[PDB]
Amino acid sequence: RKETYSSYIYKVLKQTHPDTGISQKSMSILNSFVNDIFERIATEASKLAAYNKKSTISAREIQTAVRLILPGELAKHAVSEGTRAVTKYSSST
Amino acid sequence: KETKEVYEGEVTELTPEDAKTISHVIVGLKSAKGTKTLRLDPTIYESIQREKVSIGDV
Amino acid sequence: ERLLFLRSVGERNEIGFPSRFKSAHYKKPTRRHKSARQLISDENKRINALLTKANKLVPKATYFSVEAPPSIRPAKKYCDVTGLKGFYKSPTNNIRYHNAEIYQLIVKPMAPGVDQEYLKLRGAN
Amino acid sequence: KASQSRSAKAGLTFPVGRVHRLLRRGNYAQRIGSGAPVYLTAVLEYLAAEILELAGNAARDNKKTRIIPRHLQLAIRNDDELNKLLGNVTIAQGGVLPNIHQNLLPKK
């Protein structure tokens, strides 16, 4: 048993490019890329939460970590996508 | 010699009353100087539903 | 003179701890600060406790029965920057704007965090 | 009573619960809030979607139907915020963008 993200990112590619094939090595690069991005974002958030003497990770410290890591227009588009996703998910009423 | 009589304004109330056949319909109009409530026979009500009139139309 | 005018008007209207305007007995109790947010909370929980005791009795005039209901008519939309009639709305930060020049100069190249303060005015943050 | 996952509650195609699992036993914090995996999942959504967009346009730019790592390399190195983010990582089987200095040309 081993874990990969392959079906999800495959679906992401079929949403915008239906007639496009895939090399397995390309999944190896892109899986390493998404794991590396998750890696830096998560330890930046943990480092920031350890700074503020807090024991809890919420949306705001990863928001600040996204603002710290990503370039500015990617930062603003990423926080736009994240805020609309978390407000859609938070409307469970 | 003829006489022209005109009601116009926003519809605020459209309540038909029966006795499958509507006996009458009460329409309440509204303008900038006040409101007015009118009774109507079903013949005009058929023309009203011909025009697809809902609440809030002029 | 300037420094002593406040002293003169302070000692003119000074009342000691044995205040003559009080009663013979005082017995001053201890009270919490009890901010205005939590007063609504425990009044609401007292009302709910009384209601669930009485059920297992309608209220007449409470602090929550007097409060006005929301409107039935649709609310008008205004531009968040100028206060004029807001025709459009940006898809990124959900800010209503009036025309193209406001969008090009203010709404699109706006600093992060100011959009939430703009939405704070109509309570949409 | 049966309800589906949080990913379509947030409208995302990446797994929210798997990200929550990795954030839980990744020993980053002793307590993890509810809204953190949704936000992180949305960020990974947008990053993967943009990278796949640039790769798909690169593969269309070479008249092929498959994603070669050359397409990924040229899509990353051609664009400049992806240049700044991914400056220190070497793509496996990527190659080098063509550039000649102006003074090295046969100027005559």
Place this chain on the structure above:
Amino acid sequence: KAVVIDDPPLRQTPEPFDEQSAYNPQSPIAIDFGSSKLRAGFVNHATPTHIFPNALTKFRDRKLNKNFTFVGNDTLLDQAVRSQSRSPFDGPFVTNWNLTEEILDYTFHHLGVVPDNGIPNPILLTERLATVQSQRTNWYQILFETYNVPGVTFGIDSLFSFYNYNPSGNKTGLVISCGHEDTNVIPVVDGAGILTDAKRINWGGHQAVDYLNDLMALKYPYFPTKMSYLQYETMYKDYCYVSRNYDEDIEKILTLENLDTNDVVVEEKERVAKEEEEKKLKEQQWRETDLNGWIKDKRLKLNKLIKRRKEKLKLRDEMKDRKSQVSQNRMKNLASLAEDNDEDWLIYTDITQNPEAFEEALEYEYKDIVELERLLLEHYDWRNSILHLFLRGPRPHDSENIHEQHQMHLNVERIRVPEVIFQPTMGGQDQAGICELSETILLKKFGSQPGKLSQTSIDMVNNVLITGGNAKVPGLKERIVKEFTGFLPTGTNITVNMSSDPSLDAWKGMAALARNEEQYRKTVISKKEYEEYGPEYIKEHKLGNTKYFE
């Protein structure tokens, strides 16, 4: 001409004392404990004797005396003692209570009262509509044990003003009260306020001043100075009005013919040199011979240079967009150059990025345009830009002078600030406005159908009263009359009332209740009722609150 504002001027004369000879131990005292001000005086007078803001502060001195009796009007003496003032009201309620005791001791001292075993006089007091039980019990406790008054009466200030303006005590009318922190519409039948149908909107003058502050700070983010609450308060008082029709006044407020009136302003080489000299002499001879033709040619050259520079600036702006088709064409050109000749080498050389060379070429084109303008001399406006009209009004603006760098304009806000009591959604409160609450009181209630008004509804419409301290805004009565004519049936007579000064009508209300009528004794609570019924006791009289349940 810009008008400058400042802090309000301070009172030089200290507040006076009531005489000791005028003390009557049996006369009552009317106290209006408002959120913004306090009104205290004896019953037998018509005008309240003491008016001061409901605030106090503590003063520290170097001599270590800790004199902290700067209460009410005493805070209007110095800028330092005024800025540290603190009111007992936090929101619509009273949170702390030692300062309330200090304020009541100050006003009892200034009322010329010499007590013995507490205050021997009954007390007239107002309270918030549908107040919480803790405020009532704690008010009972302080007023019955700390001061030991013989009698206590509770009521609502809007109902007190309605009793003032019809002292028969059995009339029927509609009361609209615009207060400091809330706005209430209370229906009155036969002199008794039907509190089961009264409504409250969480908006007042304080929220209006804070809304003006937030709006004006959003309009000018780089303002050099910081302005206090009182400056926003006085430009709210002086430059705000209710529009007759907001939905028409919005669409024409920023036009040029409207902004000029109702906008307020608040503060080898030698051969080349010989050839160049010959060309300059030929140009001078052409200017002296045909100046108009040379001027037209130089103007055409300047227009061509300006058009070329505009095309270059458009290309430079289009090259910055990543999602543009020019960026896609550049990516396709890069892919084709990777895919692959002197022409191909020239294309690879010319496909390089040159931002600094683009800036140098723009500078050279600007120099050429300046040369063409000089040849034309020798031989973008703010009218259509609505952002400049919103920011700096109908006048041109320069940023290099310090006089208009400290300058503020109020054009849209003058009608935007008082409009929130009619549309509360603009302030963030999900509540109906004043007019819709009046509509659903008069039309869908009290045995009245839409289109057929009952007799009680007609008597209510004929006796509409507007009160409260926030009725000072002009244009309120005409707007209320226009909307009331808007929703009512035709032929209905609408009569509205408004004081010359609607702040003091509650004091005249309890003065006329305690003085003119002996039916004040119907509402009086004594020692024995407090001792035998407890603090959770409510007298269901015609002017106060009611029992919470049924």
